[PDB]
Symmetry: D2
Subunit: 303 residues, 4 copies
């Protein structure tokens, strides 16, 4: 079992990957970008890729959204919501008062403003490429900064890095959502708290065209948790997360409705919700209701 | 083979039954009212009942809509659209100048205004129970009127009735819609020019509730030709909707819509699929053909099974 | 103040009219049919016409529905829900056991079946034109029946008619709904439990065309209590009763929406509900919500 | 006149600001991030901020979507669609054979694969914070790489930077969408080819909730060109929707839609009406013209007042 991820080593993305069951003791390959992590999977060199999909402090989200929606034959098999905790690290013997410059990824920098502005008002920012690269950069004697903002992972992995501050994020409950992406296989088992992702191409652009797509879910009691339009036909695709599993009668039926409107629709997997909240199923929308209605129609058709 | 129909004999209703193939030589039983007509079918004592459902010269329409919405299951197997022609009728020897009083059903009267005002301006309307009864009343001694407005049928059948004026109605396009109703059996063969009728009880009364029911048809490209709400104490939404859709129950979009209806309202009644009197084919919208439905099912199957 | 009604005198329709405030002591003109009652009003000879619209035991409903929907310049100014109580009447000295034949309107006959089948199983039916005409027919010595089913009004008006049975209807709570129709004037005052009627022509016949019409009400929290399609353009009109008064912001706005789709839409009046049940107004649909939203748009437009 | 933009200098973002009329001779302040850019505008210290909103070679897009959805009111006054052209850059004397390491923003790297794999198959990517920083890093002693991928802008401005390869991107149609954002003032004049942007907080999370919001546009013939949901803890539905519609706030169908949105969600933010970069006029659907709206208002008025 081999996983790729958005590298380098010790980023928030790897930290997320290591909480996946068995991944702490699996082979984890850092890739320089989402496409390469994804190519490895597509080429059979890796079983799955761990990539950010919401609120990454390393960047990478838009590239993930591009990749799953313009790609071919990929399935999301797992998601993860990982609390972000920022630490400030420096080389041993460097005190808080010695810090004149701090390197990190721009996303992390923006999220730690209150702490830094209060506790290090004389510290100026040095743009980094990732939090991990900013941290590893300290290990060079000539580094052009004195501290970095990074994940607790990197701080505990590196004996040459000392934590000077912990939990310095503006929001203590901030989270990144990640997805684990593999080649198509069997559908993960339904848990009752599941999510389904599709990418729906727009056949014709006119008012109410999205409405028509959205209705396939809504008329069937299927809640949505994410929607994004992307210019690419009607010149758009819609990337959509829905509550439920392809196995649920209401969801299977919504998928059929989607295909009829847009037969190039892509299925991106059904998988367990990281939040473990089961869909509240309206009774007229239940598996039993679908079976009862189909049985009633059959009795007419065969009467 | 036994038919019932809304009586008495000689009404526009009978005339309509008379047009159904084989009926002229079949047993035709006139019944007092629509319920009595249907009752006989439900009880196993008649094969089908011919009842009006729109623009009845004799009344009976609301009775029909309520009767088919409750009780033993029934199916519409045929519809008829019968052109309405009115004749003015009287005993032999009676001329236009001799008419002071005219009896007919109020529905007939209201449609013969133009001719009557023009040619019998001094004549008074005497309300009748049906066109046929009005006509038959003339064969009695000292009938309290001198003319009747009725169907050509009853004039042709009664020797004592003379036609004083032909085709006296206000509306050239006037037609009555009838339905022939039986106990449930097989669906007839689809034709591509079919109608499907359902009665949908409202489960819960709120804005957009009907829209939710109508969307089952609209979202699957199913055109409607009739909707009517009716109060009722049987449903906890307090209404039912009587609906005619374009299509046959076996058409994939229609079967699918029917399933959607049952999910919202499990007490939905299926009232049959049957050929359109006017023979006009359903227009099948994009994405809603049997083929599109089958492609979509196969796609979902590949996901489930792959 | 002069009213017409669906005659003759002593029908359930007149009984309904006499419960209208001041009508018991107004001039009430019986008309042989709905059109004539309506012509009188249209010609200025009568102020209003009382005609049945739901569950008439005298007939007349479909003619009412035809008239208000194909007519010109008429407004419904009042509705009434009148409990139906049937009485069986005969000439003095005629006993229950003397009744061989009963005349009434077909609608009344169908609604009294249980009583008659139990209490008079030997009585056969004689079709009548109205319950009142059936009753008045007894006053002739040569009448071809012995009893009639009619309104309590006719029974109490006519000293020559004796009640032999009362409340013989299958349903003790059965009701007829009637409407009072006048020429256009000022809108009746809003009560908070109001109804509005329109007739909407269908511009084009296609799936979802009615949906579009219905949405104008639904998207604005406006409940409907009656809908009927009629073949007559799209070849239909829709006769519609909605909850609310034209004065309510959500209703005025629904009316505007209707006009845009179908500019030949006819307004048939706003008037008090006979059931006196106030609409439950969703907060985002309230007059205050409409005023707040319009004020917010104005601040943008004028900023 | 003072602009801020997502820095540093020489990025694709600056190049885009540079295209706005009068900007080449205006004060242009580079800012660390999107929030800092907007902050300056909000504080009264800059007139407008130029920030990316789609397909940014430099990042910044999610920052933009979140920043304009909360806090002090802002308005988009202009949008720009800027074609992306990549150059390969190095110090003088350095040739293709001399390159083992290339630095750029990951977004640039991912779009230059074809050319790089073909012509520099042995070169390794060194991730940079921005294209500009990658380029500027080459002017330093013993930079840990030998080439950068950046905008033509920074190559033209830096003497120490030599263009080794021109136009090396994978996608001919690649463009970045930017927005120029100011404090609220007057609506600009409508053109018939306008865009309107709003941010709509979800009040309550249930199936069809978004549909209810989208229907405000769809039921009034208003076409959409962008929708994005974003999580947030501020709304009790837990999301907001970022939306671009075809039209100008003064168009009757748009003002009407805006009112519908406010009724559902009173905390709706108005983000401006502004000319479309591509100059494509709104198509005005049947029944939705200013004239139709005015006829309908006048009809309702006749009822109210008559
Ligand atoms: N869950 C709601 C709102 C929503 C839509 C899309 C994305 C996020 C939330 C719906 O299905 O309509
Ligand atoms: N056929 C149209 C309009 C219509 C509806 C119902 C009855 C008659 C006509 C539709 O399906 O919406
Ligand atoms: N009151 C519901 C259902 C209904 C519709 C039409 C007539 C009667 C009832 C609605 O507005 O949708
Ligand atoms: N323009 C179409 C589809 C669309 C919606 C939203 C974003 C992009 C495209 C509509 O208004 O429904
Ligand atoms: Mg350490
Ligand atoms: Mg008496």
């Amino acid at each position: 079992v081999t996983y790729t991820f958005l590298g380098p080593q010790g980023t928030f993305t790897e930290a997320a990957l290591m909480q996946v069951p068995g991944a702490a003791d699996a082979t984890r390959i850092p890739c320089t970008n989402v496409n390469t992590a994804l190519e490895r999977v597509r080429a059979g060199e890796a079983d799955a890729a761990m990539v950010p999909i919401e609120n990454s402090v390393e960047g990478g989200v838009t590239a993930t959204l591009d990749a799953i929606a313009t790609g071919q034959e990929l399935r999301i098999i797992r998601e993860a919501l990982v609390p972000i905790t920022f630490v400030l690290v420096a080389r041993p013997g460097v005190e808080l008062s010695d810090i004149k410059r701090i390197s990190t990824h721009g996303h992390a920098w923006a999220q730690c403003r209150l702490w830094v502005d209060e506790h290090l008002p004389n510290a100026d920012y040095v743009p980094g490429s990732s939090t991990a690269a900013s941290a590893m950069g300290l290990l060079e004697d000539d580094a052009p900064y004195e501290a970095a903002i990074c994940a607790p992972l990197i701080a505990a992995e590196q004996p040459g890095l000392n934590v000077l501050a912990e939990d310095i994020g503006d929001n203590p409950d901030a989270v990144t959502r990640f997805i684990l992406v593999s080649r198509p296989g069997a559908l993960p088992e339904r848990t009752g708290a599941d999510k389904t992702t599709v990418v729906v191409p727009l056949p014709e652009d006119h008012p109410g065209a999205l409405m028509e797509i959205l209705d396939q879910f809504a008329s069937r009691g299927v809640n949505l948790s994410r929607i994004e339009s992307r210019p690419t036909l009607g010149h758009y695709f819609f990337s959509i997360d829905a509550d439920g599993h392809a196995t649920d009668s209401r969801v299977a039926d919504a998928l059929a409705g989607l295909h009829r409107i847009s037969p190039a629709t892509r299925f991106l997997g059904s998988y367990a919700r990281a939040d473990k909240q089961p869909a509240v199923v309206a009774p007229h929308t239940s598996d039993a209701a679908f079976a009862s209605a189909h049985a009633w129609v059959d009795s007419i058709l065969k009467g």
